[PDB]
Design a binder for this molecule. Structure first.
Ligand SMILES: [Cl-]
Ligand SMILES: [Cl-]
Ligand SMILES: [Cl-]
Lengths: 97, 97, 97
């Protein structure tokens, strides 16, 4: 529980788009962990980033839980893809349990 | 030692306000750990963020120490509250020791 | 492998300078780990930061590897110094293996 997903991305998003993403990401971490939505934190922050030999769209995710896993990965990645259009092969997730 | 607090927040702050916060946070990590101020790092960076069902003011803190704990938590949180006005129930801290 | 260096700095850089840094940092994490460049992620993001009693130029690095070390440190730091002019004594690196 106390689940939290902080995303670092080079996507071009407006603030309102980031807010929509975070709220949605919060409901996704809720379903995925069964803790209530009221305890889920999500953040997105911009960064200049490369992955391989290009600066094409990519994302790094820090996931935190106080405490069986590719369930969370597909869920977090699909959320990223739905909001920023990032290819899943350009999304790294760090589990900090 | 080598204590470091990196804060991700959706607070609206000017650069000079962030600098004041970081310097003050450095003296707080100093008192709290007894390492000298010269070795304390603090950072604040903006992010779009939600906690629960709102984007109201919240903060995530990554604390690092090369190496008995709610002493650090209350201290870091009270600093955040003094500078950004964040409610303590909207502050998550990650201890990375 | 899956090596990734995310940098938080208070350096004043243009976006194109950050991109150059990230691409170069990717080739450096490649040499250093022998994984291919195609799997290396680097990011730089701005932050207001203090180290000691000043807000002079400093950097925090989160290094991640799925998995003998000051080889990576000197390499990452020298890259930071070549691009942002940060003094090596103002660069903290966190190894998250
Ligand atoms: Cl979604
Ligand atoms: Cl204070
Ligand atoms: Cl270089």
């Amino acid at each position: 529980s106390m689940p939290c997903a902080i995303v670092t991305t080079n996507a071009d998003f407006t603030k309102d788009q980031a807010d929509a993403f975070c709220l949605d990401m919060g409901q996704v971490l809720a379903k995925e962990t069964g803790k209530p939505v009221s305890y889920c934190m999500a953040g997105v922050r911009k960064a200049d980033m490369s992955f391989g030999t290009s600066t094409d769209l990519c994302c790094f995710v820090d996931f935190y839980c106080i405490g069986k896993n590719p369930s969370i990965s597909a869920a977090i990645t699909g959320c990223l893809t739905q909001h920023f259009k990032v290819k899943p092969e350009r999304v790294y997730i760090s589990f900090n349990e």
